[PDB]
UniProtKB/Swiss-Prot annotation:
Observed effect of gene inactivation: Cells lacking this gene are unable to produce methymycin, neomethymycin, narbomycin and pikromycin.
Residues annotated as the enzyme's active site: S97
Residue range from the parent sequence: 628 to 942 of 4613
Acyltransferase 1 as annotated region, ranges: 7-290
Taxonomy, superkingdom: Bacteria
Full protein name: Pikromycin polyketide synthase component PikAI
More info: Type I modular polyketide synthases (PKSs) catalyze the step-wise condensation of simple carboxylic acid derivatives. Organizationally, type I PKSs are arranged into modules, wherein each module is comprised of a set of catalytic activities that is responsible for a single elongation of the polyketide chain and the appropriate reductive processing of the beta-keto functionality. A minimal elongation module contains an acyl transferase (AT) domain, an acyl-carrier protein (ACP) domain, and a ketosynthase (KS) domain.
Subunit annotation: Homodimer. Pikromycin PKS consists of a combination of multimodular (PikAI and PikAII) and monomodular (PikAIII and PikAIV) polypeptides each coding for a functional synthase subunit which participates in 1 (monomodular) or 2 (multimodular) of the six FAS-like elongation steps required for formation of the polyketide. Module 1, 2, 3, 4, 5, and 6 participating in biosynthesis steps 1, 2, 3, 4, 5, and 6, respectively.
Known function: Involved in the biosynthesis of 12- and 14-membered ring macrolactone antibiotics such as methymycin and neomethymycin, and pikromycin and narbomycin, respectively. Component of the pikromycin PKS which catalyzes the biosynthesis of both precursors 10-deoxymethynolide (12-membered ring macrolactone) and narbonolide (14-membered ring macrolactone).
């Protein structure tokens, strides 16, 4: 059973210091793609992509969002390019939060200049207003009981429903800690996410008047590869990925489990290739679809690339 392949582009928790550094030396396609992404990013970032990846002394250390998000975007775009170089073209692409931007590029929907602009400017808005103001929390629990436990906490919301077992809430940090302590009181699993902002929450509305000002000139195109939106929760077949879409993506829930249930049950997708620097979503697909990661934390060189290609080809 292989049917169709989907490229998964995750959101948070996939970063690690030095991701792609060994791959910049090992893979010429990856290095070419990362140079192209650096050229695309440079009119916005002030820093250097390769310097951050090679952890040069005068480079940012991925601690801030306005760095870690365009770097993750570049790595995911480049890793998709590597996959396609080795014979694995996606029958579809599906993205999680910021991953959607990367998806939107590999689908052909957005151009690299526009994709880079989206990721960079949204990350800068997050760092200029959302940073240090919010919080996010992963709970090993269904969103059905989680939407119930959000009662009494108007400053919270459901940020993502990644699988039928673990959701992600996002909101005010004090209420995030309160909910985490309440879950630790009933003996449940709770993982406070190391994120100073609160994506997909209400606070994102603050940056709306900013986002529409910096993403207005976008020129989205018809997706060449099918593009399953986890915001609209369905296919995207029209050039409707403008700046408003990129605000909605950041402000509204991530419907990733709906996306994978749809692509698996309906459209015949059997293999999901998580194009990422560390797998964070493959432990959430249904038990019947194959999940294929790319790189792992600190395992991000040619060893890991050939291991992932071997696990894909054995699949």
């Amino acid at each position: 059973g292989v049917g169709r392949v989907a490229f998964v582009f995750p959101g948070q928790g996939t970063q690690w210091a030095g991701m792609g550094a060994e791959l910049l030396d090992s893979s010429a396609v990856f290095a070419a793609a990362m140079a192209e992404c650096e050229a695309a990013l440079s009119p916005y970032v002030d820093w250097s992509l390769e310097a951050v990846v090679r952890q040069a002394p005068g480079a940012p250390t991925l601690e801030r969002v306005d760095v870690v998000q365009p770097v993750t975007f570049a790595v995911m775009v480049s890793l998709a390019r590597v996959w396609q170089h080795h014979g694995v073209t996606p029958q579809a692409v599906v993205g999680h939060s910021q991953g959607e931007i990367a998806a939107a590029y590999v689908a052909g929907a957005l151009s690299l200049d526009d994709a880079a602009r989206v990721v960079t400017l949204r990350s800068k808005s997050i760092a200029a207003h959302l940073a240090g103001k919010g919080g996010m929390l992963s709970l090993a629990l269904s969103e059905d009981a989680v939407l119930e436990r959000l009662a009494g906490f108007d400053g919270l919301s459901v940020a993502a429903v990644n699988g039928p077992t673990a959701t992600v809430v996002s909101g005010d940090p004090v209420q995030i800690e309160e909910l985490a302590r309440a879950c630790e009181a009933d003996g449940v699993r709770a993982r406070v996410i190391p994120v100073d902002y609160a994506s997909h929450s209400r606070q994102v509305e603050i940056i709306e008047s900013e986002l529409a000002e910096v993403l207005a000139g976008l020129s989205p195109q018809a997706p060449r590869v099918p593009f399953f939106s986890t915001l609209e929760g369905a296919w995207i077949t029209e050039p409707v990925l403008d700046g408003g879409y990129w605000y909605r993506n950041l402000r509204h829930r991530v419907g990733f489990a709906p996306a994978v249930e749809t692509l698996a049950t309906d459209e015949g997708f059997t293999h999901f290739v998580e194009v990422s620097a560390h797998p964070v979503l493959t432990m959430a697909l249904p038990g019947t679809v194959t999940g294929l990661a790319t790189l792992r934390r600190d395992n991000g060189g040619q060893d890991r690339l050939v291991a992932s290609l071997a696990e894909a080809w054995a699949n």
